[PDB]
Write a protein that binds this ligand. Structure first.
Ligand code: RBJ
Ligand code: RBJ
Length: 330
């Protein structure tokens, strides 16, 4: 089997991408954020505290003839931005882009934090990291991909995120029309539960490539590119007037600037992020200070190849017995 679904930016900045997911019988379609940096499929639901729901579409398990409470199971997760959610668990039928999994753990939120309530475009998350990170207790649950894997034509999924435009998540096949050149594959460590890999270096604009190993994670659930402070300083030094602002929380730059590209290495291959992908717009409405899309990871503990980087590539998440990542230009 295969599946193929379009993923759409939630706003004009590409802050996150939501992809439609069919849950239950009859189907209830919710817009979930496919997250390769986490491993829980959770949804706003009829169980979510009413004051914490503001415009999201909810899953109502009592209206699904295939829903079953997973007795005793609870979940609770926290994200890098300080947001969180928690609740109980049902199993139900879940379909993405025509690919159906029966008995998928659907984590129903009883509580979500303020930044979930404040965004009505995200109806919950569909984790695509390794199932070792799933938070369900006392019996850890498998991700949608892990449950689908055995049925797929090939044990892979691909992320083809758009710049200010829709893109595609495919399951079970590699669309050879969706990229240019060849796909370069690189080793993955699953020891932390992430799609963790090592970039071979970087370049700023038309500058020379710096060969240096940069360990990080491929994370569709993170908006920006978070890299070591040395790398980030070298990038922003090429933008007149750019500076790190403690009050804003990162590098800002004059909105009048034209940003240089940023290249990262995948083995001997190179992925070029155009400068315009690094512009996240005014820090507040009407400001002439703009927020940068490349930021320091120093306060995180891990480097993160988020959407800024991934949207410049066609990315293969190869879930074979020894997982690998593939990157192609497009
Ligand atoms: C904006 N804070 C809630 C949130 C939204 C999306 C996501 O991938 C993680 C956290
Ligand atoms: C992970 N942060 C990206 C993001 C997604 C949703 C949102 O309301 C704000 C920010």
């Amino acid at each position: 089997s295969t599946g193929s679904a379009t993923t759409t930016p939630i706003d004009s900045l590409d802050d996150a991408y939501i992809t439609p997911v069919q849950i239950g019988t009859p189907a209830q379609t919710l817009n979930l954020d496919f997250d390769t940096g986490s491993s829980d499929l959770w949804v706003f639901s009829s169980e979510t505290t009413a004051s914490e729901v503001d415009g999201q579409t909810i899953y109502t398990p009592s209206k699904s003839t295939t829903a079953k409470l997973l007795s005793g199971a609870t979940w609770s997760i926290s994200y890098g931005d300080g947001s969180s959610s928690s609740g109980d668990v049902y199993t139900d039928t879940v379909s993405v882009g025509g690919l159906t999994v029966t008995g998928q753990a659907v984590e129903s939120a009883k509580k979500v934090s303020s930044s979930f309530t404040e965004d009505s475009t995200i109806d919950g998350l569909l984790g695509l990291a390794f199932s070792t990170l799933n938070t369900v207790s006392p019996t850890q649950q498998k991700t949608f991909f892990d449950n689908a894997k055995a049925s797929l034509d090939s044990p892979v999924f691909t992320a083809d995120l758009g710049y200010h435009a829709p893109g595609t998540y495919n399951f079970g096949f590699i669309d050879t029309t969706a990229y240019t050149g060849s796909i370069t594959y690189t080793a993955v460590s699953t020891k932390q539960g992430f799609w963790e890999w090592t970039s071979t270096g970087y370049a700023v604009g038309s500058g020379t490539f710096k060969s240096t190993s940069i360990d990080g994670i491929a994370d569709t659930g993170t908006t920006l590119l978070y890299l070591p402070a040395t790398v980030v300083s070298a990038y922003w030094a090429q933008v007149s007037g750019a500076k790190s602002s403690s009050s804003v929380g990162g590098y800002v730059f004059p909105c009048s600037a034209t940003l240089p590209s940023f290249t990262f290495g995948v083995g001997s291959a190179r992925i070029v992020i155009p400068g315009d992908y690094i512009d996240f717009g005014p820090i507040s409405t009407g400001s002439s200070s703009c927020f940068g899309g490349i930021q320091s990871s120093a306060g995180i503990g891990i480097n993160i190849f988020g959407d800024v980087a991934l949207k410049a590539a066609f990315v293969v998440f190869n879930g074979a017995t020894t997982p690998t990542l593939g990157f192609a230009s497009k």
